[PDB]
Amino acid sequence: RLQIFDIQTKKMRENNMMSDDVNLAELAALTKNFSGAEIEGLVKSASSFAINKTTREDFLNALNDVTPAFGISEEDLKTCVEGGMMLYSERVNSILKNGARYVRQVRESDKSRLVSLLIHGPAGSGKTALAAEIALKSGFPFIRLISPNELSGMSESAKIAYIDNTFRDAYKSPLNILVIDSLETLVDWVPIGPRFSNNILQMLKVALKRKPPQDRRLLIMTTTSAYSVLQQMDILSCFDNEIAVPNMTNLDELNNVMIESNFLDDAGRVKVINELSRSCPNFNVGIKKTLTNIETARHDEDPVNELVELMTQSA
Amino acid sequence: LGVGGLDKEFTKIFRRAFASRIFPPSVIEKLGISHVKGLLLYGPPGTGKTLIARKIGTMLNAKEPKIVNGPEILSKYVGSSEENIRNLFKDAEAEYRAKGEESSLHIIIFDELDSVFKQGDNVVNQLLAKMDGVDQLNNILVIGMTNRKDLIDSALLRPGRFEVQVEIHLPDEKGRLQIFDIQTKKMRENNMMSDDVNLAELAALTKNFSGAEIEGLVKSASSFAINKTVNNTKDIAKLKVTREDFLNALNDVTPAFGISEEDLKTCVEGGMMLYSERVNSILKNGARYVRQVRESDKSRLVSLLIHGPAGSGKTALAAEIALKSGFPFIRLISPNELSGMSESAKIAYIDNTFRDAYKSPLNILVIDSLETLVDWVPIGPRFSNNILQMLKVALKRKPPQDRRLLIMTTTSAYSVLQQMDILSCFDNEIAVPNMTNLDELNNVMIESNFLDDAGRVKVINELSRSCPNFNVGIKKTLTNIETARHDEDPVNELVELMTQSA
Ligand SMILES: Nc1ncnc2c1ncn2[C@@H]1O[C@H](COP(=O)(O)OP(=O)(O)OP(=O)(O)O)[C@@H](O)[C@H]1O
Ligand SMILES: Nc1ncnc2c1ncn2[C@@H]1O[C@H](COP(=O)(O)OP(=O)(O)OP(=O)(O)O)[C@@H](O)[C@H]1O
Ligand SMILES: Nc1ncnc2c1ncn2[C@@H]1O[C@H](COP(=O)(O)OP(=O)(O)O)[C@@H](O)[C@H]1O
Ligand SMILES: [Mg+2]
Ligand SMILES: [Mg+2]
């Protein structure tokens, strides 16, 4: 990419129309998966800044207007899928360190060019947020997620073609990561029949075992909440490891979350725990329920007496 | 003359199709016979069917053959398609009325005939009318060429229409040696070729090549020598191609009907260690089967089913046996290749693959995920019946004319198949078990150089009383071995992962 920058900026350099503070070497590193036309567009946008004013900052600002293919889907992953992250238990830290180890292994090994992991647990635990958070810290150039929102209102034939085209594009960068969300909902599962589409299932089953070409590598993460259903369709031999995400069952974790969420002074935080000590000592709820009950209690006239009632109802 | 290889398939053609034209009309009328007016040739593409016709045309001093393309005729408009047929024979019609019996021979060539039957009738009727009906013309000879003889309707093969039929095969070692001489005569005769180039050695390296590929190889070899001087510069007096040029050129042309080595090497095999006696026994049996195939006449078809627990390592043994065999033709029909195709498309693809497999002395077919191809699901159960019968029939059929292939398929649903009643198709069964002893784990850890012996013994010490009755396949064990290598505490992580997997 350095030579492409040289070719593009030779004309600018040759007429002393370029500042001396701009270094092309750093630009050659900032643009990680750009093409020639992308560099041309970047140069044009940067020159537009100088033209409109009547430098390095011009290029740095132009970098914010051009988004390349094979880039990072920052908005979809960051905003919707992550709305808080607090270490309420040791298991979260263990899961995060294992994920980091796997991410580093994928980058620093030749034998492992394809790793697939399955994240399953009761609904509302937070599987999807962990899946996206692990990928965000990796820093790989390419990241994409497949969720039902993309396939809504489509026919089956278009669905297969779309997924196959995405997987085809996945094999054209040094590093890739893919996320799959709510596997059961993608296949249109309803238990009365049961009813579902078999072609999509077979296509996914074939895809999940294929290896990339030319010393290339990619990582796959999937999230599910129907482990038994997947057991019925005997596709458990595709994933090389599993991770379990349980719910909360101790009052200490609830206290830690309450402290992290800035509920109120310690006086009432002690009273809530004291009441729940003998109200229902064996509650079992997820993070999503608690982080919405805390939100609900804050806006009420009697937060202490309302949060306890909500906890009793949920349990 | 200009044609090498085919020797016995040319004398027979000349005996029947052309031998009569030489003699004077007097003796022919004396005998009371008639000249043959049809001829059919079939074989794999790019093997030299038109060349023999053109070269045999020159001996008789006949007019230069005309050519017609079947798809071209069919694609044009209907009116022009009907009109153009009468144009081909115009010269023959004129010269016949001009001279009579003493006219010269005219030869016409027709290519891709089967395209007309693959669906058109007007052209066939007009062709037959000019050569069989009351409009008989006694100065033409029609030659038809097709790659699939079974599709031509039997009505055309009876006497009076395409009486003689011939087949063309891929060249033998002698054929490749002769075609190389035919190609390099000009270079040899003017001293532009080195003395270190040996053709007898070149003949063996190119195994399943056709004539066009040999010509392209010569072209690339010449290009290699030419490029070495440019960058035009007057030095061209000692230009002489050499062996190294052809050896480099060999790595440039990839033939059809050839080894798909990339799929065999990259995706399937990435590690192989003999940790037990059973692996050695399996490999020995595979080698024995290969040698049985190579040096026996009674066995021309062998099919095997390798079965075991999911993730046992099935796909690795098959590819390892296949690669060491050294066969000219190796191929796989797998869900990766069939992905995204329709049902009828799948049927046609499988049929075409099997037909192509019948055109080499030795072949290997690897069918991957047999239960997945049929699209089976235990819930219904659901499956496509039509594909099942195709696969059931194809697994017993024998290749024609003393050819041989080995089919191998892998599955993990032995109960489903035995229920389906298709277990009579497979000649033999092989079972690959999982690891059940810690001494095997010790060898697995040792041969991968996981870490030093001091920490090596500790893992065994811990597993001795952690969980002595583990049962895990090679894939999961080797993945855990590698995933524990990038951690701060290899021992605890490895022990916990291996215990959890069990
Ligand atoms: N440690 C944590 N792990 C997961 N989620 C957390 C954590 N701390 C806070 N949260 C909050 O939990 C909320 C619920 O998680 P998330 O949105 O990932 O749900 P989910 O498991 O994908 O949901 P569903 O099962 O309905 O598909 C997130 O908005 C996140 O803000
Ligand atoms: N001796 C061996 N036998 C089998 N596999 C081995 C051996 N040594 C190492 N391996 C590794 O085992 C891994 C598992 O192989 P493979 O994926 O083909 O198995 P499988 O049981 O057919 O898998 P699948 O679940 O896709 O059906 C391969 O990556 C190979 O690297
Ligand atoms: N035995 C042979 N000797 C020399 N050249 C051959 C031979 N067989 C095929 N060829 C090459 O094949 C080319 C023509 O083949 P082609 O007309 O395509 O036959 P078909 O169409 O029947 O496959 C020629 O360029 C010729 O050099
Ligand atoms: Mg989910
Ligand atoms: Mg396999």
Numbering used by the authors:
A (entry chain G): 424 to 477, 498 to 758
B (entry chain A): 239 to 357, 368 to 479, 488 to 758
Sentences copied from the publication:
SNARE (soluble N-ethylmaleimide-sensitive factor (NSF) attachment protein receptor) proteins drive membrane fusion at different cell compartments as their core domains zipper into a parallel four-helix bundle. After fusion, these bundles are disassembled by the AAA+ (ATPase associated with diverse cellular activities) protein Sec18/NSF and its adaptor Sec17/α-SNAP to make them available for subsequent rounds of membrane fusion. The disassembly requires multiple ATP hydrolysis events in the presence of Mg2+; as few as six ATP hydrolysis events are sufficient. The side-loading and side-release mechanism explains how Sec18/NSF can disassemble SNAREs with constrained topologies.
To address this topological challenge, we next determined structures of the y20S complex after initiating Sec18 hydrolysis by adding Mg2+ (referred to as the ‘hydrolyzing condition’). Informed by a fluorescent protein disassembly assay, we initiated the disassembly reaction and waited 7 s before sample vitrification. The D1 ring is also flat in all these substrate-free classes, with all D1 protomers bound to ADP. This uniform binding to ADP, as opposed to the spiral staircase of apo, ADP-bound and ATP-bound protomers, likely explains the flattened nature of the protomers. In the D2 ring, all protomers are still ATP bound, consistent with their role in oligomerization. Class 4 consists of a configuration where both D1 and D2 rings are heptameric and class 3 is similar to this heptameric class, except that the seventh protomer is only partially occupied. We observed heptameric states of Sec18 and NSF, split-open hexameric states of Sec18 and NSF and a transition between split hexamer and heptamer of Sec18. Hydrolysis likely accelerates the transition from hexameric to heptameric state through the split-open state for two related reasons. First, while ring splitting itself is hydrolysis independent, hydrolysis is associated with large-scale conformational change in the ATPase rings and likely increases the frequency of sampling the open state.
